[PDB]
């Protein structure tokens, strides 16, 4: 359970990041297909190449999604309903993979907040993103 | 990875009383069946909306056939299962687009498999020899993934 | 979540190991430990060889459990709270173990039960001991 | 794992610039805060009651610097991880009692302590790098474990 000091930290944290969330989301991305070339299984459609378009315009849609995660982050399970349903339905990426984007996710955050990454905050996102996984997988079966 | 030689005179033993064809349907049908979101690479293989629908369609059990026989081959190289496997997981990875993951969920589904149609056949030792198998075979077809 | 037929089934199963639930118990452990060598490293003072009456007993620990999420299937987190405390905080066993035992509750099931054991009942199953486990690590951090 | 030149020569040029001790203080500190339940190895290490207590005991920040230096040490044998990690290996099973995961845990925040400290030059290909590495310790490490 996030704790009602783990979401003062995101909240904190997710503010600084403020109108940098979609070029972080796109770090996380390209970090991720880097890091853990399986996880490019799901994106064969996709063009991967360096600076890619495409890959930039899907780091925006998954940073809104954690921005609105983080709005919400009291009633997750509502808020992220819709994305849950296409990530167990449409999508189906196997949920081994939501540790491997959440830990890129961690690692771009850290790259870019060298004074708010702290111990506790490190603790409070990493636990935040587990949420938002487990949110997204809630529905695979 | 590898196996004690007691192990692998248990695996092979086990194995003899195997129907791979059976078998290979039975374990790719249960995946489908358990871990519904590995429907995702078969749409063209039909009706796959019931356990029923999934266990006696006839792509997913010529499929399982397929897979598993190559499995079923592979228990002839337990000391060289990156080579032996190689191609497959090239193939896998560069036109298929599979997670690996795939790979280690039907080895524990195969397991279960292997459990239910042996009974207390499959005993503990026998199957701590199989999962030294299908962890081999899954790292084996992870292996060449880029 | 575990659907309405998921309950069935797993009640059904459940009820069918009947009064072998100690000795499945014990079977699942013998196996986990034999199958998965690292598990072992939370047991350094059991008696961890085939016949040992440490793992006998605690098999008939872990099946009274399992018993009591069955019969409380509606309300897990609560009724198996103790019990998550104590995994949680007390024993502090990584919670990457919990799959592993799980899958070998299900071999030892697989095992024992020919004519219940179908793709839907191992589905229900499967399910169930994944949920046992999310319930069992919900208070680590 | 196996790096490829270019890997080898990512990984070495960063690690000429990392403070050892002040790495490892932070990646071991950082994991008993993070995932509390590693704490259970080190009852002995006196009060790790807050995160600030934990980063700042100096049993924690020894350590962390004893078990980054392995690491660093190793970091001279990478195409032969299994090989120099094996005596520790058998040390962690059998004396210690130590869960492989925990390595697993150890390398993710041991990445995340460099991206923190290095920032932008903590690169996507430069991490892909030291994901490999973290991987193949972990992994050596776990390889003599029975
Ligand atoms: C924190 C976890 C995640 C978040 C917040 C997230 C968010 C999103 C969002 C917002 C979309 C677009 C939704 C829409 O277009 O309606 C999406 C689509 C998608 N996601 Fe995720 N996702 C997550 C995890 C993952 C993971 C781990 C994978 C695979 C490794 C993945 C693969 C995909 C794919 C393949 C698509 C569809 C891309 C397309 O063809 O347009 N997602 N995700
Ligand atoms: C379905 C999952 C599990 C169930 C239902 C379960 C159940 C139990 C129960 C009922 C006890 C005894 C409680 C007491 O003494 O008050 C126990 C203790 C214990 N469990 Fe589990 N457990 C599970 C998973 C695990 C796993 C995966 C591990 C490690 C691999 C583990 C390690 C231990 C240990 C070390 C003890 C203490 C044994 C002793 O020293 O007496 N448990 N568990
Ligand atoms: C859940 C997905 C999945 C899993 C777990 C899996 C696991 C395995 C394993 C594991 C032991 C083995 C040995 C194996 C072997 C094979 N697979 Ni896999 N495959 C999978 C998805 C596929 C798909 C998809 C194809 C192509 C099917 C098609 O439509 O022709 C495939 C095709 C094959 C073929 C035929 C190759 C060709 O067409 O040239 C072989 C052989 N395989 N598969
Ligand atoms: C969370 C637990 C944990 C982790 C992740 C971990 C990860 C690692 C890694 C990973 C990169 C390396 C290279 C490593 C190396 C070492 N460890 Ni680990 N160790 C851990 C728990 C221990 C414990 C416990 C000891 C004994 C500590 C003490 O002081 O007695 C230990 C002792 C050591 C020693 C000292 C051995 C001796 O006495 O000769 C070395 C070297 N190690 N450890």
Redesign the interface.
């Known amino acids: 359970?996030l704790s009602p000091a783990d979401k003062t930290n995101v909240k904190a944290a997710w503010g600084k990041v403020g109108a940098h969330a979609g070029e972080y989301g796109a770090?996380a991305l390209?970090?991720m297909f880097?890091?853990?070339?399986?996880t490019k299984?799901?994106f064969?459609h996709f063009d991967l190449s360096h600076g890619s378009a495409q890959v930039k315009g899907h780091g925006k849609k998954v940073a809104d999604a954690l921005t609105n995660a983080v709005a919400h982050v009291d009633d997750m399970p509502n808020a992220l309903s819709a994305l849950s349903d296409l990530h167990?339905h449409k999508?189906?990426?196997?949920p081994?993979?939501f540790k491997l984007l959440s830990?890129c996710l961690?690692?771009?955050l850290?790259?870019?907040?060298?004074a708010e990454?702290?111990?506790?905050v490190?603790?409070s996102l990493?636990?935040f993103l587990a949420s938002v996984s487990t949110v997204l997988t809630?529905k695979?079966? | 990875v590898h196996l004690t030689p007691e192990e692998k005179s248990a695996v092979t033993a086990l194995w003899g009383k195997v129907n791979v064809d059976e078998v290979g349907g039975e374990a790719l049908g249960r995946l489908l069946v358990?871990?519904?979101?590995?429907?995702?690479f078969f749409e063209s293989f039909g009706d796959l909306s019931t356990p029923d629908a999934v266990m006696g369609n006839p792509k997913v059990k010529a499929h399982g056939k397929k897979v598993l026989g190559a499995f079923s081959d592979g228990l002839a190289h337990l000391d060289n299962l990156k080579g032996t496997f190689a191609t497959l997981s090239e193939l896998h990875?560069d036109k298929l687009?599979?997670?690996?993951?795939?790979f280690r969920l039907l080895g524990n589904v195969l397991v279960c498999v292997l459990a239910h149609h042996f009974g207390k056949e499959f005993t503990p030792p026998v199957q701590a020899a199989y999962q030294k198998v299908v962890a081999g075979v899954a790292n084996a077809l992870?292996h060449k993934?880029?």
């Not at chain 2, 358990?34 to 995702?40: D, E, G, K, L, S």
């Open positions: 359970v770090e390209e970090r880097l890091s853990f070339p399986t299984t799901y064969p167990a999508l189906r990426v196997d081994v993979n830990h961690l690692v771009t850290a790259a870019h907040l060298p990454f702290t111990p506790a490190h603790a990493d636990k809630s695979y079966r | 358990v871990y519904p979101w590995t429907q995702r990875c687009h599979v997670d690996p993951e795939n992870a993934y880029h």
